[PDB]
Amino acid sequence: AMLSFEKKYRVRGGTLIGGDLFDFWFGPFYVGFFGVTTIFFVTLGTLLCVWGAAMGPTWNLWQINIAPPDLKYGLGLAPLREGGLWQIITLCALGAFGSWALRQAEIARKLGMGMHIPWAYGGAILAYTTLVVIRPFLLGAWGHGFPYGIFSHLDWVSNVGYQYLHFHYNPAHMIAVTFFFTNCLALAMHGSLILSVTNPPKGTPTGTSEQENVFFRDLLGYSIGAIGIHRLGLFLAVGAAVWSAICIVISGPFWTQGWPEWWNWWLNLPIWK
Amino acid sequence: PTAWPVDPTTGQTLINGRPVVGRVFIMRKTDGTVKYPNVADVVAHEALAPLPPVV
Amino acid sequence: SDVKFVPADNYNGSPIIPTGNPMIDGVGPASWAEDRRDEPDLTYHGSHKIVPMRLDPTFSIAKGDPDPRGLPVIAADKQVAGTVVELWVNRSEPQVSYYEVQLASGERRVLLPTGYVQWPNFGLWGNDKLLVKSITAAQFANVPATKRDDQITLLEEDKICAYYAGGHMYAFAERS
Amino acid sequence: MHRIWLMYDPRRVMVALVGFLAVLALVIHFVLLSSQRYSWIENGTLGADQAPVGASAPAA
Amino acid sequence: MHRIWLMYDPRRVMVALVGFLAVLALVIHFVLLSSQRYSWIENGTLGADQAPVGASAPAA
Amino acid sequence: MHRIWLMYDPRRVMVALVGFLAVLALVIHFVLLSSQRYSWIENGTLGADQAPVGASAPAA
Amino acid sequence: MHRIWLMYDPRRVMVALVGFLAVLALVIHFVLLSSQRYSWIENGTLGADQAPVGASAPAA
Amino acid sequence: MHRIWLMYDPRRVMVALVGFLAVLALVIHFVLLSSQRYSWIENGTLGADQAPVGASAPAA
Amino acid sequence: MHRIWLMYDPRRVMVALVGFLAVLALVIHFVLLSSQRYSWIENGTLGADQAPVGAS
Amino acid sequence: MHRIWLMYDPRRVMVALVGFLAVLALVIHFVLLSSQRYSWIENGTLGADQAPVGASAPAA
Amino acid sequence: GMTEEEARRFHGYMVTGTLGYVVVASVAHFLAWSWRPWF
Amino acid sequence: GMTEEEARRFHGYMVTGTLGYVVVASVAHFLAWSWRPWF
Amino acid sequence: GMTEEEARRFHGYMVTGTLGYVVVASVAHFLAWSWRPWF
Amino acid sequence: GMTEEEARRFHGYMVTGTLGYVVVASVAHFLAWSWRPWF
Amino acid sequence: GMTEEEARRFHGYMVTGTLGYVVVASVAHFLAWSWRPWF
Amino acid sequence: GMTEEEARRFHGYMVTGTLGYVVVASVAHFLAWSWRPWF
Amino acid sequence: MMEYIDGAQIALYAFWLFFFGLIIYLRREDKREGYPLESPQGPRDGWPKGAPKKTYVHRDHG
Amino acid sequence: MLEYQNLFTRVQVRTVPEPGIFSYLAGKFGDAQIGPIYLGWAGVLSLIFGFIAIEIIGLNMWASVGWDPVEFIRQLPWLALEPPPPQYGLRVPPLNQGGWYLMAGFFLTVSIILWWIRIYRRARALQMGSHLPWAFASAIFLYSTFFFQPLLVGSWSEMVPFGIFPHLDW
Ligand SMILES: CCCCCCCCCCCCCC(=O)OC[C@H](COP(=O)(O)OCC(O)COP(=O)(O)OC[C@@H](COC(=O)CCCCCCCCCCCCC)OC(=O)CCCCCCCCCCCCC)OC(=O)CCCCCCCCCCCCC
Ligand code: BCL
Ligand SMILES: CC[C@H]1c2cc3[nH]c4c(c3C)C(=O)[C@H](C(=O)OC)c4c3nc(cc4[nH]c(cc(n2)[C@@H]1C)c(C(C)=O)c4C)[C@@H](C)[C@@H]3CCC(=O)OC/C=C(\C)CCC[C@H](C)CCC[C@H](C)CCCC(C)C
Ligand SMILES: CC[C@H]1c2cc3[nH]c4c(c3C)C(=O)[C@H](C(=O)OC)c4c3nc(cc4[nH]c(cc(n2)[C@@H]1C)c(C(C)=O)c4C)[C@@H](C)[C@@H]3CCC(=O)OC/C=C(\C)CCC[C@H](C)CCC[C@H](C)CCCC(C)C
Ligand SMILES: COC(C)(C)C/C=C/C(C)=C/C=C/C(C=O)=C/C=C/C(C)=C/C=C/C=C(C)/C=C/C=C(\C)CC/C=C(C)/C=C/C=C(\C)C(=O)O
Ligand SMILES: COC(C)(C)C/C=C/C(C)=C/C=C/C(C=O)=C/C=C/C(C)=C/C=C/C=C(C)/C=C/C=C(\C)CC/C=C(C)/C=C/C=C(\C)C(=O)O
Ligand SMILES: COC(C)(C)C/C=C/C(C)=C/C=C/C(C=O)=C/C=C/C(C)=C/C=C/C=C(C)/C=C/C=C(\C)CC/C=C(C)/C=C/C=C(\C)C(=O)O
Ligand SMILES: COC(C)(C)C/C=C/C(C)=C/C=C/C(C=O)=C/C=C/C(C)=C/C=C/C=C(C)/C=C/C=C(\C)CC/C=C(C)/C=C/C=C(\C)C(=O)O
Ligand SMILES: COC(C)(C)C/C=C/C(C)=C/C=C/C(C=O)=C/C=C/C(C)=C/C=C/C=C(C)/C=C/C=C(\C)CC/C=C(C)/C=C/C=C(\C)C(=O)O
Ligand SMILES: COC(C)(C)C/C=C/C(C)=C/C=C/C(C)=C/C=C/C(C)=C/C=C\C=C(C)\C=C\C=C(C)\C=C\C=C(C)\C=C\CC(C)(C)OC
Ligand SMILES: CCCCCCCCCCCCO[C@@H]1O[C@H](CO)[C@@H](O[C@H]2O[C@H](CO)[C@@H](O)[C@H](O)[C@H]2O)[C@H](O)[C@H]1O
Ligand SMILES: CCCCCCCCCCCCO[C@@H]1O[C@H](CO)[C@@H](O[C@H]2O[C@H](CO)[C@@H](O)[C@H](O)[C@H]2O)[C@H](O)[C@H]1O
Fold first, then answer.
1. Nearest CA distance, C15 vs chain N (angstrom)
2. Distance from the CA of I39 to the CA of which of A89, A175, F31, J58 falls in 20 to 30 A?
3. Which residue, among P10, E58, H12, R15, has the nearest Cα to C96 in the 3D structure?
4. A80-99 in b/e burial notation, b at 16+ Cβ within 10 A?
5. Which residue of O has its CA nearest to D44?
6. Where in the sequence is N-formylmethionine found (chains D, E, F, G, H, J) (predicted)?
7. Which of C9, C10, C11 to mutate against chain D (most D CBs within 10 Å)?
């Protein structure tokens, strides 16, 4: 089925690989070559997660836990029953997430859009790749990855935090948190402003860019403008994930003490040592 | 209780009185993990409750 | 048959194929919202939101920026398509919305949405010409017209922007 | 039966089939390679009288 | 009864049906393979007298 | 009663009914398979007297 | 009293009602299944005097 | 009093009322169900002199 | 037979085949390299009687 | 046979080939450098019978 | 929207359906009570 | 949408399918009951 | 759209395929029951 | 779109490739069975 | 597109290249099997 | 777009460079084997 | 006196019923443009059915 | 940084007179004044209450390093104004043992509420929906639970300390 304006847009072209062979739709979805590779990796990676649940202790959704290998296996593939399955699923996940971004690039090209959406999603892929490839590689064992399980990965986050005694003191983490919180504020403001001009009190004319510009200036003391608020949202949201990736990759590979004692440099500046 | 009987003739494991061809192992889930039954069972593995404070 | 396109084949979810020139007919990334209201957009006080700068002396180029007027416009085929005669401005959110281009080797003047222009060296230095990467200097002749030269309708905005949007797919193609 | 190829485009049914067979073959091999009895890379040289067999605890 | 195919496009029903049956078949196999009694890759060579049975109620 | 099919499109109702009944059936089976008494894959061969039963009130 | 169907579209209300009753029933069943006294899947075969009762006021 | 139905659309007030009454009824039922004295699903069959009572004042 | 190449451009299939086979070869080597029996970089000089077997 | 270079732009193929070989060479060198047997920077001067060997099979 | 006589006709089905449902629920509570009373 | 003749025709199948489903479920419950009663 | 003649032709295939599949699944259960009964 | 003649021509290869693939799988299963039976 | 005589030409190369690759791989397995058999 | 005679001369270098690369790798492996063999 | 049922669990299902109600509402709002869908065998509404297309009252200036 | 639209790369424009029929209007959209940053009565009061709250926090931090202005900057992220001791429960505590804390918490809370009034009044005056005030109300709801949860457990000692690293310790 198609939107009442859609058919006009369903042309060939814009594919990065495979020419016309995969250039077609399946219901709402565009396929394309990276559509095919997406479904391959999604299906394989999902069915291996189901197998990980089957050979584990329970089917309870919250408790399923596909753990990485012991650190003693280093950068090798463990026995599948001992974390090797987690490694294969990780390769599936990387394949899926990469295919998804490249498929989005084909869709954007076919509509004459800029590439902004694939690159924004690249920020999430970077954070994932840091957690399961780059940081475990710099530490020398794939077992430093997080387990695939809805609550068991929160146990991993907890224990990694306390490996540095007081993870709140991580300086890059403070920046990343500030981006996440400021992003949520900015999203609430932008959402509210657009809705409040397009949905005024009953018996009131539809508002204008001038009214939202005036109200925004009353809120922040300056006028961001229509292009600017979307630039700011993208900057805050993607910047949050980039600073997240930084804050975890420095924890272990680069800094190994508690995070509070990192701040010793500030206390020892020569103006006040 | 820990292993099935072994036939002295052949070194061969007997399950419910009849031989198995192969080397028998007791099946377990990943790393021998077992779902926690309830709060009371978790608490029964812990130390007793802390004593009242000295104020 | 005036119908702008036909299915590539009979299976579900197959692409369409344009019959005529997709940039003129408006197919795929060259298409526009054909039911869009054919009226000017308005400021809060009800004046025309997008107008040529000569109609509102409130507006002027920020000092130490180049005025783009009189510069040549270089198309995707490196040909000189024309020269900038006028700027159109958004009066609700002050910015340049369109360049107006006097066509080289032609009678006509056409609008050019600034999203499709770029400066050499991205404006940092030089600034002696404008680059339009999306269409050839021949295709500049077919850019849609506005009914009047003092105002532009929302439909005309959609038509003009859709023309340059399609170029990145169709400008260097025999599909015309 | 051949009229199924009028309902569906054979060019992309075949992609769906080959993709299905690839995923299914890989899943079955990884399931076996996880098992103890069929972890053939480590233990494939064992004869059937030495190959692992799983049982429940003897439940005295 | 054939008029159900005037109401639904058979080309869509076969897709829904194959999708449903593939998921359902895989669900059941993995559920069984996760059990003790039907973990057939490890224990399939046991006879029905030897295969696991879950615990009874208390004997009195 | 049949004019319910003028009030609602039967093609939409049947899809909704099938979706409801499929989800409901799966829910009930998963509830039973989660229980002790009806963990039938492990314990289905037990007789009705041997099958688990929940605790009664403590007799004074 | 029938004029309420001028005020509300009956084909919206009838679906809203089916949704309400579905959720309400599932809530009451899951609440009862979570109790001690009425977890009928485990303990449904107990007689009424054998079924659990919550603790009284302690006599003292 | 009826001018209330001119001041506000009865369709809005009806939904607001039913929403209020349902939310209030649910709050009260679960508050009682959470209490000791009125946890009727577990202890509903207790007589009134057997039902729990909160602690009295010290030293009469 | 040959009409398969009228459906699928052999120029493209041949690239996708190379990509598939390269990934598959890498996966099979890394599986074997990490096993005990076939860890040939550490133990390849062992004789087939000396090589590990996963009995337990 | 040289007509293969009409199928693909050699300018593109050579860039892909050099990339593949460069990554492959770095991967193999890193695998060897990380091993025990071939950690040649620290141990390259050891004679072949002094170089590490992985564990053998148990005697029984 | 409905005419008043459509609303009249629907209301007859709607009331009958509600009462028939409450009757079936009444038998369910009869059965449930006789199996395990809650008071 | 449907004519009232189509609605009438469809309803006959719908009731027959519903009866057939309820019959199979009734046998399924009696098999379950005789294997392991829940009351 | 689809002709009633075409719907009747497809129905012949669809019923036959459904019943064939159920027959093969019936044999699969016969084998599984002979190997390890679940009741 | 392909003719019903081309459909029959394609279907002949599809059946034949399916049979060949099933034959190979059958021999592979009987090799696997002889090495290490699963029932 | 491609003509059927180009397809018949390429099919010759593809079959030959595929089978030559399988031959080389079969020899590699013969070497690996002689070195350390997996069954 | 490359001509067939440009391809003809290009391929000769491609074969030559590949052969040279394989020759250097073959000596590199034989040196490594003499230093510390892996079988 | 309920052992398993507790206030946090009660609150959480109260939220779930609200949240799924919100998702239904949001999907109705998503369908004010481009619906009903076009297909062979006619128009399609999806689920939930969309709210109607919305007209906006302009400000007068005369 | 460089950007993928020309729109403000170069040839940005100056309205030398005001926009609204860079520069800004001095007029009204209806009854709403358009020139200055809006305050009204609630905005003015919010700034006074919020200023004294921030001033109490800063002065307690500065007193805690013994008025040393070098240590006030050097140690700033570790400084706090701290809640009362646990033994007081909800009773009024000594001034140097959480009395200033509850005072700053009160003045900050009133300042926040008055800022919500300001935003609510301004949205109405600009003839806009109340979406933004209710969005801000959701943030105020979370903030208020740092009062109500300490209240419900019965001790002001459970409140969040005012301080950069100290509130993260909490
Ligand atoms: C926790 C906080 C954050 C949590 C954050 C959570 C965010 C959730 C965002 C996703 C929700 C929207 C998804 C959506 O609308 O997809 C379109 C699709 C179809 O409707 P349509 O698009 O308007 O119409 C098209 C269709 O009619 C005809 O299209 P066509 O013929 O071309 O293609 C075939 C059909 C076949 O339908 C399907 O295959 C879809 C069936 C599965 C839908 C599951 C949706 C997710 C439910 C989540 C709620 C819960 C389910 C339990 O159409 C399609 O091909 C459409 C494909 C859409 C694929 C969407 C997949 C989304 C997966 C989301 C997973 C979320 C995981 C969290 O919609 C539906 O099928 C109905 C979904 C309605 C919303 C769910 C509301 C649930 C309320 C509670 C139960 C209500 C019981 C009645
Ligand atoms: C259009 C038909 C009318 C109607 C007309 C009648 C008539 C006439 C009689 C009853 C009778 C009864 N109705 Mg009735 N009844 C209606 C709707 C209902 C509903 C409901 C949920 O809407 C319910 C719960 C009942 C319930 C009852 C019982 C109290 C009682 C006997 C059992 C019975 O009929 O069982 C439930 C049955 C149904 C829901 C199906 C509809 C009614 C059936 C067809 C009546 C058959 C039995 C009747 C005695 C036959 C008449 C001939 C005799 C030789 C005198 N009726 C509908 C709206 N009902 C009888 C009575 O008063 O006994 C004391 C009686 O004589
Ligand atoms: C820029 C940074 C932020 C960001 C942005 C972002 N995310 C995006 C996009 C963008 C711009 C998309 O365009 C893309 C999209 O299409 O959204 C609809 C996407 C998306 N962000 C997603 C999720 C997501 N984003 C997250 C975060 C972020 N997204 C950042 C905060 C998180 C977090 C923090 O937890 C999640 C869960 C998806 C909804 C979607 C990408 C969909 C996609 O890639 O689909 C293909 C793959 C699958 C459908 C399934 C793959 C299954 C695997 C093979 C097996 C499972 C492996 C997995 C590792 C198991 C983990 C278990 C957990 C319990 C740990
Ligand atoms: C939906 C949830 C998110 C959210 C939303 C949100 N917050 C909001 C809003 C919204 C929608 C607003 O509209 C509102 C706002 O104004 O935004 C600009 C606000 C706001 N969110 C704020 C902060 C904030 N939001 C946060 C978080 C969040 N906000 C969530 C992520 C956080 C975090 C993560 O910790 C913080 C710190 C504020 C910037 C602002 C509310 C401002 C306010 O209430 O100010 C009160 C006033 C003072 C503290 C006094 C200041 C005193 C001056 C420094 C003194 C100067 C001297 C003075 C002039 C003297 C007096 C003289 C008189 C004569 C005048
Ligand atoms: C926590 O509690 C827990 C533990 C979960 C416990 C509690 C569980 C609960 C609360 C359960 C509730 C269950 C329930 C409530 O109502 C259940 C209600 C179930 C119902 C109604 C089932 C109905 C099934 C009907 C079927 C299958 C119909 C099939 C019809 C067919 C095949 C014919 C199709 C038409 C044809 C062929 C004609 C085409 C002609 C055409 C087109 C023409 O002529 O044009
Ligand atoms: C763990 O325990 C849990 C899992 C929890 C327990 C619970 C389990 C549950 C709830 C199970 C539910 C099961 C279920 C419910 O419905 C199962 C229902 C299954 C069904 C109905 C299967 C039907 C299969 C039908 C098939 C295969 C049809 C094949 C058709 C063919 C081959 C013909 C195609 C057309 C051709 C060739 C030509 C067309 C010509 C044309 C067009 C022309 O000529 O024009
Ligand atoms: C862990 O245990 C778990 C996993 C859980 C257990 C469960 C497992 C489950 C559920 C398994 C299910 C399996 C299954 C179910 O159906 C499996 C079904 C498999 C099937 C159907 C395989 C079919 C293969 C067919 C092939 C290979 C065809 C090849 C065709 C060829 C070569 C010819 C190509 C055309 C040519 C050459 C020329 C065309 C002419 C043209 C163009 C012309 O002339 O124009
Ligand atoms: C324990 O680990 C796990 C992983 C779990 C275990 C399991 C693994 C599994 C399941 C593996 C499955 C593998 C598999 C499945 O099918 C593997 C299938 C492999 C296949 C199909 C290989 C095919 C190779 C074909 C080749 C190389 C062809 C070369 C052709 C050449 C060179 C000629 C090119 C053309 C020319 C020159 C002419 C141009 C025209 C010209 C010049 C002109 O026109 O002039
Ligand atoms: C840990 O163990 C793991 C790693 C897991 C185990 C390993 C596993 C795997 C999978 C290994 C795979 C190996 C492999 C598979 O393919 C390896 C394949 C290798 C190959 C093919 C190498 C090819 C080299 C070719 C070269 C260098 C060519 C050079 C050409 C030159 C110099 C001439 C260029 C042109 C010029 C100068 C100008 C011409 C004239 C022109 C233009 C004119 O005249 O115009
Ligand atoms: C000279 O001027 C100087 C130099 C001093 C000015 C400089 C000041 C500086 C440098 C200030 C620095 C301030 C900093 C760094 C502040 C950091 C604050 C942070 C990070 C705060 C974080 C969280 C705080 C929370 C959540 C506090 C919540 C408190 C609440 C909700 C309190 C509510 C109290 C109420 C409602 C009522 C209390 C009164 C009673 C109990 C009596 O009820 C009526
Ligand atoms: C009726 C819904 C089905 C579920 C409820 C089952 C309990 C009722 C058993 C059936 C008894 C007869 O039930 C009765 O049916 C007739 C039509 O047949 C309905 O009659 C309704 O429609 C008819 C026209 O069709 C109108 O003239 C009448 O005024 C109106 O009430 C009655 O409202 C209902 O009371
Ligand atoms: C993948 C690397 C491993 C080695 C792979 C290849 C090993 C075997 C190579 C054998 C070479 C001879 O093999 C044979 O070559 C000739 C051309 O010479 C091909 O011939 C093909 O091209 C010629 C000329 O374009 C056509 O006339 C002919 O109809 C067509 O079949 C044959 O189809 C192939 O069977």
1. 14
2. A89
3. R15
4. bbbbbbbbbbbbbbbbbbbb
5. O39
6. 1
7. C11
Which helix (H) or strand (E) covers residue L18, if one does? Answer: helix L4-35
Q: Is the peptide bond before P37 cis (omega within 30 degrees of 0)?
A: no
Does R14 contact C at CB distance below 8 Å? yes
State how far the Cα of R83 lies from the Cα of R104, in Å rounded to an integer: 10
Experiment type: cryo-EM
Q: Is residue C112 classed as helix, strand or coil in its secondary structure?
A: strand
Across the interface, which of B1, B13, B25 has its CB nearest the CB of D60?
B1
CB contact at 8 A, Q4 and G32 = no
Buried b vs exposed e over R62-98: b needs ≥16 C-beta within 10 Å?
Answer: bebbeeeeeebebbbebbbbbbbeeebeeeebeeeeb
Cβ of P30 closer than 6 Å to ligand 9, yes or no, is: no
Contacts of F40 in chain M (CB under 8 A): 38-39
Q: Under an 8 A CB cutoff, do E56 and F53 touch?
A: no
Half-sphere exposure of R132 (CA within 13 A, CB side): 29
Protein residues with CB under 6 Å of any ligand 7 atom: D 21, 24, 27-28, 31; E 25-26, 29-30; I 1, 3-4, 7; N 6, 9-10, 13-14, 17-18, 21
Resolution as reported, in Å? 2.3
Instruction: Please give the helix or strand (H or E) that residue H10 lies within, else none.
Output: helix H10-34
The closest of D59, H30, R58 to E56, measured between CA atoms, is D59
According to the annotation, is E2 in a ligand binding site? no
Is A104 assigned a ligand-binding role in the annotation? yes
Q: Are A52 and A147 in contact (CB under 8 A)?
A: no
Which candidate, C137, K9, R24, J55, places its Cα nearest to that of I42?
Answer: J55
Rounded-to-integer distance, Cα G48 and Cα F57, Å:
10
- Spatial distance between the Cα atoms of M2 and C64, rounded to a whole number of angstroms: 70
E interface with D, Cβ–Cβ < 8 A, is 10-11, 14, 33, 36, 39, 41-43, 45-46, 50, 52
What is the 3 state secondary structure string of chain I? CCCHHHHCCHHHHHHHHHHHHHHHHHHHHHHHHHCCCCCHHHHCCCCCCCCCCCCC
Query: Which secondary-structure segment (H or E) carries R113?
Result: helix R100-125
Angle among Cα R78, R81, R85 to the nearest 5 degrees reads 115
P18 lines ligand 9 (CB under 6 A): yes
CB distance from C45 to chain R under 8 Å? yes
What is the DSSP annotation of F1-60? -TTHHHHS-HHHHHHHHHHHHHHHHHHHHHHHHHSSTT-HHHHTTS-TTTS--PPPPPP-
* Residues A83, A90 contacting (CB under 8 angstroms): no
Which ligand approaches the C-alpha of residue A92 most closely? 3
Beta-carbon contacts of F29 under 8 Å, excluding residues fewer than 6 positions away, are: none
**Does residue C144 have a cis bond before it (omega within 30 degrees)?**
no
Q: How far, CA to CA in Å, does H37 sit from each of G59, H51, Q5?
A: 15, 6, 16
Q: What are Q33's two structure tokens?
A: 């443009």
Q: Do chains G and F touch (3 or more CB pairs under 8 A)?
A: yes
* Partners of C130 in the β-ladder: C73
Number of Cβ atoms within 10 Å of the Cβ of A54: 20
Please check whether residue A140 is in contact with residue A74, taking contact to mean a CB–CB distance below 8 angstroms: yes
Whether chain O lies against chain L with 3 or more Cβ pairs closer than 8 A is no
User: HEC states along N1-39?
Assistant: CCCHHHHHHHHHHHHHHHHHHHHHHHHHHHHHHHHCCCC
Phi-psi region of O22 (alpha: psi -120 to 50; beta: other; left: phi over 0): alpha
Give how far B15 is from chain E: nearest CA, Å: 6
Tokens representing C69?
């007027």
Nearest CA in chain E to B17: E50
